[PDB]
A paper describes a structure:
EphA2 promotes cancer malignancy through a poorly understood non-canonical form of signaling involving serine/threonine phosphorylation of the linker connecting its kinase and SAM domains.
In the second EphA2 mutant, we replaced only S901 with glutamic acid.
Author numbering: 587 to 635, 639 to 772, 778 to 898, 905 to 976
């Protein structure tokens, strides 16, 4: 559960501890439903001690032990999760060939392919509900201190009741074909700081979630499809952003833009995203106002106010002092603007460089708070 110790960096141990070894005789492989990286994927039935329908991921013959470890490690990770919007693991087969990962059956398959199949056949409210489910799954993952690093519509599965669940777990996931090498990551879904500095956090997952929102509201359009990967690199590094989908509520596109904030600290947390989507869903009239859709627009020009002290500290990469600011009562912004350099020093900022950085930032923050701009 959340808060308990996790095993995200030891695949074999996670397989031993958090997966159920299933006897091959209890598995019935039926039709082929897809092709994974490590082998074919089948639909089948599993007998437990009544038969239940399941998805069966197999490991190709002639595999290397490294591929076997990476394959079963996904199940080792999946077995630690229990949530409505996270793909559920039934078990594994590691003792006998072929290696198998057995999960719940998701009849409608990948979300992007599903939405392209059902182009325009859902209401806006239903799409928002799909996004809310994905966001709830991601909130659970963030609360489990698990960074997905590869959140995308193609990695969201849909069952016969249209429940959307996050899938695709593991560690060294350079395997996906969309990722391309740089400085191997799916650049069209990856936050700027994660492409430049490989800083993968839940905030970069929030960026990816904004991209997923775009994918859902467009019914599976490829992000930046007009642009090459190099042009996408320039676009994201310079502040260009995707335009609004057609028939997209203004609040949803604004949420997208919030997920795409250049500074990761300003992006909302997944808990905030779930709450926001819940509020929109309970008052569906809030979804009637649409963002201006221009079919000729393919990309938005770069865009040109802190709520928490932690947001401002992470802005200047001084988050390591955040706890020290709260513990001394400096919990508001209009209270940190009333700080002297000695107050900064006593709460535990000793390095002169950090003192200088914080002081220079406080000057600009005082400028911000005292700004007046009221149109007459
Ligand atoms: N639980 C499930 N229910 C129904 N179909 C499933 C399924 N799991 C996988 N599939 C099908 O198999 C396809 C690929 O599966 P999967 O994504 O797990 O392989 P993979 O993770 O190795 C690709 P990548 O490495 O690029 O992320 C999916 O597109 C999907 O159609
Ligand atoms: Mg996978």
């Amino acid at each position: 559960g959340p808060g308990d110790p996790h095993t995200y960096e030891d695949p074999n141990q996670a397989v031993l501890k958090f997966t159920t070894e299933i006897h091959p005789s209890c598995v019935t492989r039926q039709k082929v439903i897809g092709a994974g990286e490590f082998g074919e994927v089948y639909k089948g039935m599993l007998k437990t001690s009544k038969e239940v329908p399941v998805a069966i991921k197999t490991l190709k013959a002639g595999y290397t032990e490294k591929q076997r470890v990476d394959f079963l490690g996904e199940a080792g990770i999946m077995g630690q999760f229990s949530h409505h919007n996270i793909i559920r693991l039934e078990g594994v087969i590691s003792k006998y060939k072929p290696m198998m990962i057995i999960t719940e059956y998701m009849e409608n398959g990948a979300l992007d392919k599903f939405l392209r199949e059902k182009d325009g056949e859902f209401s806006v409210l239903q799409l928002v509900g799909m996004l809310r489910g994905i966001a709830a799954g991601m909130k659970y993952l963030a609360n489990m201190n698990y960074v997905h690093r590869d959140l995308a519509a193609r990695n969201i599965l849909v069952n016969s009741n249209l429940v959307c669940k996050v899938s695709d777990f593991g560690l060294s996931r350079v395997l996906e074909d969309d990722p391309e090498a740089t400085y191997k990551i799916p650049i069209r879904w990856t936050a700027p700081e994660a492409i430049s500095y490989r800083k993968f956090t839940s905030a970069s997952d929030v960026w990816s979630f904004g991209i997923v929102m775009w994918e859902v509201m467009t019914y599976g359009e490829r992000p930046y499809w007009e642009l090459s990967n190099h042009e996408v690199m320039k676009a994201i590094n310079d502040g260009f952003r995707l335009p609004t989908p057609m028939d997209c509520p203004s609040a949803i596109y604004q949420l997208m833009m919030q997920c795409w904030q250049q500074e990761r600290a300003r992006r909302p947390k997944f808990a905030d995203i779930v709450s926001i989507l819940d509020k929109l869903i309970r008052a569906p009239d809030s979804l009637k106002t649409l963002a201006d859709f221009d079919p000729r627009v393919s990309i938005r020009l770069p865009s040109t106010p802190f709520r928490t002290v932690s947001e401002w500290l992470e802005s200047i990469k001084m988050q390591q002092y955040t706890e020290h600011f709260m513990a001394a009562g400096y919990t508001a912004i209009e209270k940190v603007v009333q700080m002297t350099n000695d107050d900064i020093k006593r709460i535990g900022v000793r390095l002169p460089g950090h003192q200088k950085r914080i002081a220079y930032s406080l000057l600009g923050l005082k400028d911000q708070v005292n700004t007046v701009g009221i149109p007459i």
